[PDB]
Amino acid sequence: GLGPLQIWQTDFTLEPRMAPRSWLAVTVDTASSAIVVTQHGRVTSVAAQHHWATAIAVLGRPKAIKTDNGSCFTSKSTREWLARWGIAHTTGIPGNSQGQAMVERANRLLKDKIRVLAEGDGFMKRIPTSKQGELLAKAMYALNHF
Amino acid sequence: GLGPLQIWQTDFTLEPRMAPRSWLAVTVDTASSAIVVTQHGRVTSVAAQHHWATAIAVLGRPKAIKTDNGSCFTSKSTREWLARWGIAHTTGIPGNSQGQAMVERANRLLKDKIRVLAEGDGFMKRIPTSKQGELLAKAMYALNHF
Numbered sequence: 001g002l003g004p005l006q007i008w009q010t011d012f013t014l015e016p017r018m019a020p021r022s023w024l025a026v027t028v029d030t031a032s033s034a035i036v037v038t039q040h041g042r043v044t045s046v047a048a049q050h051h052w053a054t055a056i057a058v059l060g061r062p063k064a065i066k067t068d069n070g071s072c073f074t075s076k077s078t079r080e081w082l083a084r085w086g087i088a089h090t091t092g093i094p095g096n097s098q099g100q101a102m103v104e105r106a107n108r109l110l111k112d113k114i115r116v117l118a119e120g121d122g123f124m125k126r127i128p129t130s131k132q133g134e135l136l137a138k139a140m141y142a143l144n145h146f
Numbered sequence: 147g148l149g150p151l152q153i154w155q156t157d158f159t160l161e162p163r164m165a166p167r168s169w170l171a172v173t174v175d176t177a178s179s180a181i182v183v184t185q186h187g188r189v190t191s192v193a194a195q196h197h198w199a200t201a202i203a204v205l206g207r208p209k210a211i212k213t214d215n216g217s218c219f220t221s222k223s224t225r226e227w228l229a230r231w232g233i234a235h236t237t238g239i240p241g242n243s244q245g246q247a248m249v250e251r252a253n254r255l256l257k258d259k260i261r262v263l264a265e266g267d268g269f270m271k272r273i274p275t276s277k278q279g280e281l282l283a284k285a286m287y288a289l290n291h292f
């Protein structure tokens with residue numbers, strides 16, 4: 001059968017409404033356009049690995065993951081975690097090309113959706129910590145399943 | 147098109163290897179046989195709701211969820227959370243029938259898989275807390291994607 005390769009794009013984006021764990025790791029599966037998001041307190045190699053561990057459970061094992069050159073992505077620790085799994089790690093193409101547009105678009109939509117849902121629940125600033133998990137899951141659902 | 151109805155079965159099972167959060171919530175989608183599992187410190191109405199919030203993000207919104215008559219499932223809080231989402235909540239059929247066999251089978255396979263992976267990593271008893279999340283995600287992946 002002919003179809004798209006299982007290649008992911010992953011990035012981190014800061015969302016203060018979700019503080020203290022305001023670092024959102026976002027993965028777009030370019031083959032299905034599915035979006036997986038998890039929240040973290042810091043942008044470390046270990047946060048990137050925990051995110052992908054969750055994404056693999058949800059989406060399955062990809063052939064390759066495209067990131068920018070953030071240190072959590074280029075560290076020895078992360079290089080070794082990806083090798084343990086047999087996942088190729090790659091980056092942006094030259095030729096005046098940018099990092100990864102699909103995942104940057106997803107960052108924006110995600111942040112828009114979080115704001116819309118939070119304000120509907122009456123949270124004009126930071127979402128109360130005990131409400132964050134379900135609101136994030138509701139944002140992911142809306143971005144994925146119609 | 148003709149296919150199966152989107153009906154889930156959900157249950158809790160105790161797994162001391164995953165302590166202090168040793169309560170595993172397990173949902174089987176009867177339509178795809180997909181399995182979603184999350185871990186919790188206690189079996190409360192709020193734990194059940196956080197699990198389903200995650201399952202909805204992963205699997206989409208089901209038409210109905212079958213549980214046994216555990217109190218976390220039959221409380222007012224949980225009845226109201228399911229109504230907010232528009233999800234029917236149902237239970238086992240009479241006629242000498244048991245609770246929900248598919249989800250009970252999944253409970254067993256999950257616990258077998260956790261044990262196999264833990265012992266391979268050298269953990270004969272409780273899995274160190276910082277290792278639990280990725281090991282659980284690896285168990286879910288193996289039970290789902292081949």
Ligand SMILES: CC(=O)Nc1cc(S(=O)(=O)O)cc2cc(S(=O)(=O)O)cc(O)c12
Binds near residue numbers: 007009030066101103
């Ligand atoms: C590997 C990878 O990331 N590939 C890709 C990245 C991006 S981008 O928008 O993120 O730049 C867009 C892509 C578009 C297509 S196509 O079906 O429209 O032809 C195919 C790709 O393979 C793409």
Ligand SMILES: CC(=O)Nc1cc(S(=O)(=O)O)cc2cc(S(=O)(=O)O)cc(O)c12
Binds near residue numbers: 155212
């Ligand atoms: C709603 C629901 O749970 N339905 C079901 C529960 C169980 S059980 O094993 O869990 O008892 C088995 C089922 C088997 C089938 S079939 O395709 O083989 O005919 C269909 C169902 O709909 C089933």
Ligand SMILES: [Mn+2]
Binds near residue numbers: 011
């Ligand atoms: Mn980045």
Ligand SMILES: [Mn+2]
Binds near residue numbers: 157158214216
């Ligand atoms: Mn039970």
